[model samples]
Target chain A: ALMGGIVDSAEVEELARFAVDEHNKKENALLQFSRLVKAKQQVVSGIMHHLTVEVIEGGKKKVYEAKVWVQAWLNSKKLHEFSP
Target chain B: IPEYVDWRQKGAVTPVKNQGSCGSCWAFSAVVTIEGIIKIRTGNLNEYSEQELLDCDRRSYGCNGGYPWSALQLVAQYGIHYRNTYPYEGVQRYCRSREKGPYAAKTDGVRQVQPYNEGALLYSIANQPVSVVLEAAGKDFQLYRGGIFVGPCGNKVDHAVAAVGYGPNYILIKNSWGTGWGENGYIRIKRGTGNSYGVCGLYTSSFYPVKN
Candidate 1:
């Protein structure tokens, strides 16, 4: 999750756009906002591992595509129980 | 409650406000969602109080600041039921209380958490409530005029907020900058454009659901 902090204004916005464009180029991929939120949320909520995705170049923006596995638990209980 | 939509296009439910020089965005977003949630669950548009969340939930660490997870966590722990349970005092220099409020409930309450990724976050409002945090991309960000702004960065985060819902082709987000800014206190992230906030890792946070 993103720790709140003051950032340089213009540069960050530019970087945000550049990152999107670059991520949209890969196959089976489209830059996703919800996935990013979930990954970061898991990190902050103490329930995440790591993200394995790639950014690609789209028309005027970058696209992102990846299959990331995140851990979800409620009140310290695992969200899903995999069968052995 | 409505036709599963994005955070935007909800039609001016409440006005917006700014957090200013302080890193208390978590407080602002917390209240914003509380305002909406109260309306969603109770059918009342009462603008509770942001200060209540800032002061009551010790785990969240109010003005000292906290994550979106901790933001709502404080509310749940404090047993927030009535809108007036914690009065809204707008913004202040410091957090009001270091202890739980009289109206506050217990910290160990039934709560929900959703650790979604960027793609799912783009449409998370369809399933649940989410407050996204991301780095505002670009140096010219402070100069952003009106329209939906896109970015040019990759994997970075610095700010946070909630995705109330979505539109047919866009997601609606509630921002802190009072109402005079950005599409009437909200930003509509265009769906299927790959030009949303998460470009630089915005909306990259967990979403939680709780029963009041």
Candidate 2:
């Protein structure tokens, strides 16, 4: 199939390596900022949850890993959960 | 009570213009207000030059920032040229000699909407466009595609735009950020909240030109 020639060439491996580094840098920045905010807030009653991001570009699938923090509270009548 | 009022649909509002990357929203806001009232008065829609105010009006800064009220005063005094004559350059160019663009339109004066009066603003918009300022720095505002923006906005007025019409729950605005942003360079903001000042303090500095 043409897919093998297009995606499996030796040059393609280097390009893929560079792209992985770029994507990791951006993904790392987001997670680092999220962690910093979470550390600054000192959340006592919250959940650290995984947030999976999937991006489709140039007919290829790229998945990004991230996390979110949700704070939980209980009022007189109901339980409230919110994110900042 | 009536539900809506759209000056654009009635053919009173002029086509939108882009201000490029300059912070000259104040000039665009003032010029559109003049254009609207002039069209309503003469039954002829003519575009006015924001460049005239951007360059000539000493009361307001060119690209850095300016005030609509100051530009309105200059128009009332020196009058303004048509866009076709002294066209917009989107920068703070030197004020040209009056002989360059001899063609001009004159306005009698302008009046400020009563402070924090939403009803006054509605009445003014029904007659002509009103120049107003708003808080424009927010992710919600920057990427706003469409919808009645109730805001993640505050009372810090920074950007200037014109109010063209209104609905039961929103006010239609004409922005100078080009057609690519928001709803083709327009925004619908939540209205009739009974806040008197309205959302983003839109009524705080509202004013409109008088053709008569």
Candidate 3:
């Protein structure tokens, strides 16, 4: 439902964890989320949220950046991309 | 009366690093002056953390946009750490250096080059790498591949970079845009524009860190 422009009024940490959850489910590994750092969202069809998420794997620090797309009106939740 | 000087040749400049979608160029600019100053003093080129400032400097918002003024002041008070210890994430993480510091080093304070005076800028660049603010939002700047950047640019002062050296008519700027932009992450700006605030408004504001 985000119109257009850089989005802020939202649950950033939850959005990032959802991105992480999307990847973890695919990889079949239980990676723990640590913190959220960068968060920015823009609207194309709905909202394209880019988040930089910090996570822990084997007690070592790792970075995860995800573009989580949410199209609210028509209804769709998707992970566009995730990278280390 | 030196005709030319480039810190890259002198081994004072670091490899051009990518800021990666973060609007945090000032932290990179502030850290570069310290990196050069420390190398000039210690004779060892070491890397310091921009992530330390990007995360810890409360006055400035990381990845949003901030100034070198707030970023440098934070290091002067809290000190800065090694890049290896607090690597860049290009995003706002919680301040991590409070627990992870004895600090690599800190500036005594900052030194201001007499504003809008290219002469004063040259004086500082003669001794150390200096930071300057300028216009980088121009189409020419964004599309630049190489060659001396003689601009049709303006004085918006939206971006910050390090003036690492100078030749007769050009000031070599070290950028944070990685090795692919401009001249291998450097830009030789047209210096000595008859007016003050020479090319792209870099001369409007400038500074360096004091190590002693």
Tell me, by lDDT, which candidate is best.
Answer: 3
TM-scores of the models, in the given order?
0.57, 0.70, 0.72
Evaluation by DockQ, superior candidate among 1 and 2? 1
Ranking by DockQ: 1, 3, 2
Docking class of 2: incorrect
Report, for every candidate in turn, its global Cα lDDT versus the true structure.
0.47, 0.66, 0.79
Chain B structural similarity (TM-score) per candidate: 0.72, 0.95, 0.97
How would you encode candidate 2's per-residue C-alpha lDDT over B129-197 as one tens digit per residue? 999877665446655778999887776666778999889889899987667667887999998777766
Candidate 3 deviant stretches above 4 angstroms: A1-84
Instruction: Assess candidate 1 and give its TM-score to the true structure.
Output: 0.57
Q: Please provide, for model 2 over A1-84, each residue's C-alpha lDDT reduced to its tens digit, 9 standing for 90 to 100.
A: 100000102322222333334454654522211111111111111222232334343455545433322222211111121122
Query: Which numbered prediction scores highest in TM-score against the true structure?
Result: 3
Q: Positional deviation of B1 in candidate 3, in angstroms?
A: 3.8
> Candidate 2 chain B — worst ten consecutive residues by lDDT sum?
B134-143
Runs with alpha carbons beyond 4 Å of true place in candidate 2? A1-84
Each prediction's DockQ against the real complex = 0.09, 0.02, 0.04
